[PDB]
């Protein structure tokens, strides 16, 4: 549309299950707090995600 | 096949246990074949792998 | 050497037994939740945050 300048902007909104999810709202199992707040993110390890 | 049950109870109780405590189930059947042409009959015999 | 033969008298012969085994599972329990603040939502840019 015109006397919006030139650029378009729109946003997009990450799944919680994703690397790309880079937050400081976790909170772990034990109650402590912790650096991802994504749980295990695209990990597919049984090790990992267990 | 002929198949007898007797419960405990009166049924088994006897001179050989006033009290009846005890049961049975039992199979039992005749069985016989005639082999009229054993030529009819073919058989090879071999090891079989692990 | 081990067919359950019987002859014309009877008597307790060929008696057997059975045996049965037991399996088992259990529930665990899980659970994630997020927090926010009322002006998050109403003065966000996006109306459909929530």
Same mark, same amino acid.
């Given at each position: 549309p015109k006397h919006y300048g030139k650029t378009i902007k729109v946003y997009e909104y990450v799944p %919680? %299950?994703?690397?790309? &999810?880079? $937050?400081?709202?976790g909170i772990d199992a034990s109650g402590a707090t912790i650096? $991802? !707040? &994504? %749980?295990? !993110?695209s990990s597919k390890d049984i090790g990992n995600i267990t | 096949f002929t198949v007898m049950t007797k419960m405990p109870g009166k049924e088994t109780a006897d001179r050989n246990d006033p009290y009846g405590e005890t049961g049975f189930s039992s199979i039992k059947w005749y069985y016989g074949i005639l082999?009229? #042409?054993?030529? #009819?009959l073919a058989l090879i015999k071999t090891v079989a792998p692990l | 050497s081990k067919l359950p033969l019987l002859t014309?008298?009877?008597?307790?012969?060929?008696r057997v037994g059975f045996t049965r085994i037991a399996r088992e599972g259990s529930i665990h329990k899980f659970g994630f939740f997020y927090e926010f603040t009322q002006e998050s939502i109403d003065f966000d840019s996006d109306d459909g945050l929530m």
């Open positions: %919680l %299950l994703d690397d790309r &999810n880079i $937050n400081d709202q650096v $991802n !707040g &994504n %749980l295990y !993110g | 082999v009229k #042409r054993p030529e #009819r | 014309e008298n009877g008597g307790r012969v060929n």
